[PDB]
Amino acid sequence: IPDYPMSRSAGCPFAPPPGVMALAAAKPLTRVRIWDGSTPWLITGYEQVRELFSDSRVSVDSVFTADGEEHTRFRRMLSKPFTFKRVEALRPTIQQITDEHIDAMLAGPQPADLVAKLALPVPSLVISQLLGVPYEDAEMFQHHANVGLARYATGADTVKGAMSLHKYLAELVEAKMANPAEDAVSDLAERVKAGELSVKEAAQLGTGLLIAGHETTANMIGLGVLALLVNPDQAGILRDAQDPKIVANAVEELLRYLSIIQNGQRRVAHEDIHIGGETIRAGEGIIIDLAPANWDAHAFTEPDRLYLHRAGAERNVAFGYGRHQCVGQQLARAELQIVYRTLLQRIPTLTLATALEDVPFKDDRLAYGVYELPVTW
Template identity: 55%
Template sequence: MTETLAETTPHSDEPIPAYPMPRASGCPFDPPPAAQALHDELPVAKVRMWDGSTPWLVTRYGDGRALLADPRVSSQSTLPGFPHPNAGFRENAERRRSFIAMDDPEHARIRRMVTAPFAIKRVEALRPSIQKITDELIDGMLAGPNSADLVSALALPLPSLVICTLLGVPYEDHEFFQEKSSLMINRYSSAEDMIGASDALTDYLDELIGVKLAEPADDMLSELATRVGSGELTRREAASMGVLLLIAGHETTANMIALGTVALLENPDQLAVLRETDDPKVVAKAVEELLRYLTIVHNGRGRVALEDIEVGDATIRAGDGIIIYTGTGNRDPELFPEPDRLDIGRDARRHMAFGFGVHQCLGQPLARVELQVVYGTLYRRIPTLRLATGAGQLPYKHDGLVYGVYELPVTWDA
């Protein structure tokens, strides 16, 4: 395949297909059909973004994994050619850099400042408190009428409470930071709204870091404040890191809890396995399979080529934008037989839901524990849990960088 051939995409009247691509009606868990067609027939192809740019879309598992680990591929979002989801993201990248949009060694230096709280042993020590929060939230559901919005009752407050505790952010401010977070990850947000939300959250975290400088506590913001005091970070840099940790710490897990529940309720044979087991290994396997099957970071991972790179028959030129589309990569039949089937007994550990390489998700140990606790608790405690509306009627987050549902009305036998 050459770049010229990539100008024509199978099953499309357009020379270069628009991106992102819509999901099929009635198939909320599957990647868009156009993306799947590229995976099957033209796995490295040009797509057209909102600004007219034409980055490469890489849709197969092996190619994506190799590029995510390739030092010739940059995460620097300020480089020309980087595929930004909208104007607000591009402007934000120019105004305030994040360590996830840096390359090594700068990326590694800053990332090391916040890795310790997410170490597996540290996170495992949090499991009892996460279990306690989960049980209390479910108690609250059961104490009311036999119906609830699972997003507001459990999926969103659980990870928000946990990340607030780790960071040292007052949970009573959750409505403020959840609203601003939603604006910052919505690809239809105007640049003005996105920048305003980013500034408001950064100011908020900057103020908290000022408090921690004067009165340090046992939390991550206090640790960042120490780095400010030693001159390793400016207050604004520390606040920007806090914004990233706060958003990532609640948005992704909240959406996985809710969307994973929808997927399980639509696959009752798989739900029955979780509902009837108390084996943590069975639950852990289910978490990995749901992460693979749903791939909620559903608009891919943006990069820029620093050198010419051969990918299959294609040549990605230096300066070209790249989008590694893990949604189809995680449905690659070469690695996952019958990939469109949810099978919580499958070994799905090699999925790329958390990315791959040096930039893979810092908080994945915490997300795994939170999901294991919820999936291992909710369906056993409320065995008759079911949707209060059809899955096709749910408000899915097609507009977000993180896929999920805005609301999840459920009911159960009283």
Template identity: 55%
Template sequence: MAETLSRAGQHEAAIPGFPMPRAAGCPFDPPPALREQQQAGPLTKVRLWDGSTPWLVTRYAEQRALLADPRVSADITRPGYPSPSDSRTNSVGFILMDDPEHARLRRMVTAPFTIKRVEALRPSVQRIVDGLIDGMLAAPGPADLVGAFALPVPSLVICELLGVPYADHDFFQDNSRTVINRDATTEERGAALGRLTDYLDGLMSRKRKNPGEDLLSGLAGRVNQGELSQQEAARTGVLLLIAGHETTANMIALGTLALLQHPEQLTALRETDDPALVAGAVEELLRYLHITHSGRRRVALADIEVAGRTIRAGDGLVIPNDIGNRDPEAFTDPDRLDIHRDARHHVAFGFGVHQCLGQPLARMELQVVFSTLYRRIPTLRLAAGMDDIPFKHDGSVYGVYELPVTW
């Protein structure tokens, strides 16, 4: 049987599968096959679980252009959308919607994430970080940095911001892990999402009757005023709760591991009292690690000319920003971790109207953590070999399940 060519000029039989495995011994780098696709050109084809062959966008400039293009849709229900699983109903909140509905719902929760409002939270986050470090130092080592520190920091912060009882953290952390687990079945993810939605729905009912000063109470007020349904409010709460603790927790743990493997970078960060260097280190770690490693998914609404090729209306797009952040055209020597680099133009938070709403909060939390943890515990080191660290290769959010440390 003769081989045929895809629109990318690839032989159909040679189209690689996606997602792609990382190389053994290189846990901080994107998969080698992604680098090969990037070298082949900004647009190639990949094959997903269902046999579909969307475009893979691997270069920084084309990623930003397409993420900002109004002819590109984030709506998971549109034909051609390259869904990461066999369910299009287990989506969370407004991130998989298009304007105007996306903008309507997003505007309702934007205010608490403005830079001014987030900066007002910095002293509270500092107290949380110091308190957790005090607890680690008071307990016998070694410790699991994930369980003792990396996960509680953003969980406590997002619970305070949303008005979610931290006492329920085991429940929402366990179900969140299932929702973002690539190896979980559709039924498992749907059940976990249902439990979280029911939980937020019940919390929303209570806040409609007895509101506080938190974000969920603000949404409850909008429900009472008829601006959105309680189901919309609950699903928005689920999105903010999952995104508010999972991503930052993994960045704290994986960032610490990366710094421990680059001691000269860790020393420079630990010894500085320059907030600008700390902020720059956070941006570089976001660029270098990029924990959302399953690729942002989109579908073209119209024909789009990109890099001499035509993306047809209805074609799916997979945009893995981890390899975009390693594009040598955008970042000199991109595979080197350098906290002195100006990496602010990375695409770890996406680009365009769907870029991460909570990025000011994530940046501030990481700045507090990375300016405090290594100064408070200057002898922090791994209590296990790199081969014994359990990485989250099965998750849509990358990181480590555990990080044994001592001091």
């Protein structure tokens, strides 16, 4: 019985770990051994990965962990913050923050670290605006969010970065209980006012949103941009594209390719479950593995290929499937749309500043990324 997870390859470093991709060639599903030493069921094939995500005999063992109607409770509370018009309305400020950040990057020296100057700051600012942190508190919020993800930060640094983030979100929650605007925390604040969640639970959740949608999107920006640069054929397409429909699909094809969230929360089966030709005896653990699904040649004809015109690209599960899909979905999509198109058209001479093999990737972090991305232009 093999060990999970497995490590990515040099020379194929965008690719899912080859050892996982092999396993996935044999059986839509195989039994693995993990950190603690328990032996859960790694789901690899696309068709069955979607199924278990959408199967009630399956559930997850705060809204991250909460399940049952307990999850519907937590997740209904999140509907108002990420409606369509609620995210639509953010496209402008996503575009102003990007434009701002690209400028400051152009005005500085080069080679410049795209991670440092763009990939990290833009999500946490966008998350911020969605929450509704006042303008006054942008840089402090930024600081206490970018202290965590620094490759140079202590653990203590990361602790007393999060401590004051929870402390501040509680403040702003109460503040939005007082003065509700149209932002996200006002919505959480509206829920404290109805006996539904304490300030702590709301501060936790606000904190929860920042974490969830920061290093993820950051990593999509960074890795995404890199992937674009070694694939100039595609960079051109994304840059000259004239349809919002087509640029949206090119984001979908980037989420599928990079598949930064390789895993997916560790679920468990309540009843016995028969697919892939084996039986998931109830009780046993389930790991619904998204990279190999996104790289399943049954549904994505040339999975090693980065084809931004790829026909069914929003077929992927880079955001998960079923109950517990990424709540950030539409917002993160806007982010990558904005940032990708805008960088690629304002900086058409953007060039990778080192040999690719020099680039530092984020192996250990569950979410795959690059630690810094030097560009010239």
